[PDB]
Amino acid sequence: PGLRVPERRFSRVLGVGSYRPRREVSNKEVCTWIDSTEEWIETRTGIRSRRIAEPDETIQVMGVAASRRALEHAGVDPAEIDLVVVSTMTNFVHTPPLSVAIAHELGADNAGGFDLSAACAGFCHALSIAADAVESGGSRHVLVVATERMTDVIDLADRSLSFLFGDGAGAAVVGPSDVPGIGPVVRGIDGTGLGSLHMSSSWDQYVEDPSVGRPALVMDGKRVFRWAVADVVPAAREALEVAGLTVGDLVAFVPHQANLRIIDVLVDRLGVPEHVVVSRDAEDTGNTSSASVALALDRLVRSGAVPGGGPALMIGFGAGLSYAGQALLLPDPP
Amino acid sequence: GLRVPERRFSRVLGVGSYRPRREVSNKEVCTWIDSTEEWIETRTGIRSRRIAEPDETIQVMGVAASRRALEHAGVDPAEIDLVVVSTMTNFVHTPPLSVAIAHELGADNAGGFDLSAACAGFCHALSIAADAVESGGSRHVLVVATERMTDVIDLADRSLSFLFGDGAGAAVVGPSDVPGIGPVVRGIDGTGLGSLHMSSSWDQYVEDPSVGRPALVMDGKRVFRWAVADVVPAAREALEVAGLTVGDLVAFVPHQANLRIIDVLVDRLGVPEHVVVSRDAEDTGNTSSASVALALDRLVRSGAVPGGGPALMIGFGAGLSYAGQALLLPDPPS
């Protein structure tokens, strides 16, 4: 009674997809909500425009749309999906899990599903869970969806970060591969950051004293910026070594679109060559939280700017002050 | 990335729990709703449950259960590579509870993320931990299921106020020489979304009182019928993919929805007389994802069963979904 010796295997991203809210919002329109200047929102962040979800574009709608596109690219039917993992931090329904409603809508009635909550690092955590699942021999096809409506958790009328977070969703399908297509994940924390990226309040408080009402992100952007340059850079190189790869091996670098500036710093401290394509979707996407790396990944692969099978470095980082990232073989363009 | 890492096997090395100090008998329950002790016990098997006080927040409960598991496993917080927290009663969008818990615990060398899958949460987390360890990328993983079901039930509503309790349970998983955790089985029934869901989302709360704070609403009979139809075959599947029959079982740890369902599961499943079946609901009530963790901690610490013995664990509920697996039990502590 020593159990069965399951037969592992290899896995990698078979297909990617995404959903981008129809309503685009330029910095000019953002300056009509807050007291800013299109010119500040760009030299500091790097955003020229972001997309904001409309009432009908719930995270479920966006997640199912992003998922379908991923399944089409991978050429996999919903019936073949064994697990659906949804990463989000902007869900106001305690239960049942969003991942179960998405699976059901998609037609994947053979699947299970949890939701996952890890702030910006969410997609890279979900992806490593998917990789481990398939490689364990227990699952063959896994769907990973990162759907966020950050606008629901941020006061647009708050120059703090009202020009920062965008909406949208990204998905990836992982399945069998003859060779390792996803490198080991690397993850870590700062526990002293809890006060750098928290919620104005908890819904529990909202009901007891309305005074501090509806929850919403508040951030000490200097501390996180320094944390990002301090720990995210080393993690990125670790993510590289653990997978047996160097900066020069990459054909792409898809970091969470927190800020083009931080992105410049990262690309800088990391020694990223000029030949390796770097995601900067933040320009017109904004900051989409855990969906950020997924949205970017989808754009990258579907551009032709990079060939299949080539190494790509991904890494999300943020709230709680925690990161997660891994290196992976890009899929063939659709 | 191309690099074949070294796989190992994993098992549960320690288990722990935190049970709120306040015990609430059916008699006290009946002073909150129009009901009787006879009715409650006859319909659920529950005689008493523990209700968390203001100071026993899910983070407090999670930390305490985690320290018991770590103590039992003889593992240092510094040795923890991942912290997975399962919970559906968290009113804080970010940062992740897991990160807050990992910090207070002392495990600053870990990352982690929150998991949300209603009653199936602990089993999904366990399969993530087993996979992480077995993949070679992590050596020790901490899984914590912590809940205050009382925070999302009315307490005055006659329909379910006598079913939930609060509490947390945890488990440490690490390397083993032989497979110590079977493959996870999981599935859903999406047409059952309307049988167990929230009275409203915080979104709808923020827009109109009354509406109340999001509270749990389910269809006894529908959930019970689905569990009997789908969970009995899932339980058998869990044994099969691990290469076991029900007779090699020393224990059965089903989610404690209530003892009447468990009674049917045991009967339909054909669990032999020699197997210990957790019936913790009798004094614990239903604690959602923490149900199985609490029952496992109690089982192991009872001294009724030996380390190494096969145990079947399965959680089931929202919405609808389940996840379960077989595993080799830890030696009881001392």
Ligand SMILES: *C(=O)CSCCNC(=O)CCNC(=O)[C@H](O)C(C)(C)COP(=O)(O)OP(=O)(O)OC[C@H]1O[C@@H](n2cnc3c(N)ncnc32)[C@@H](O)[C@@H]1OP(=O)(O)O
């Ligand atoms: C996943 O979990 C989530 S992502 C967490 C997202 N954040 C990041 O990813 C990290 C982002 N790091 C930062 O955001 C940086 O904090 C900033 C640059 C984007 C914000 O600006 P700064 O940090 O440089 O500094 P701040 O002191 O807050 O502002 C400096 C002065 O700027 C002036 N100013 C001008 N116009 C604006 C507007 N329109 N918004 C806010 N104010 C701006 C004044 O704000 C500041 O003061 P001063 O001019 O009197 O010195």
Ligand SMILES: *C(=O)CSCCNC(=O)CCNC(=O)[C@H](O)C(C)(C)COP(=O)(O)OP(=O)(O)OC[C@H]1O[C@@H](n2cnc3c(N)ncnc32)[C@@H](O)[C@@H]1OP(=O)(O)O
């Ligand atoms: C993880 O993700 C989630 S777990 C949370 C949901 N899951 C679980 O809770 C476990 C599911 N448990 C159940 O299925 C139970 O098996 C029940 C709820 C189905 C037990 O309820 P019954 O079917 O036996 O009752 P019902 O037919 O709806 O009502 C029958 C009569 O009961 C009378 N009555 C008397 N006292 C009470 C009190 N305390 N509460 C509610 N009603 C009571 C009246 O209820 C009904 O009419 P009648 O008695 O004249 O026929």
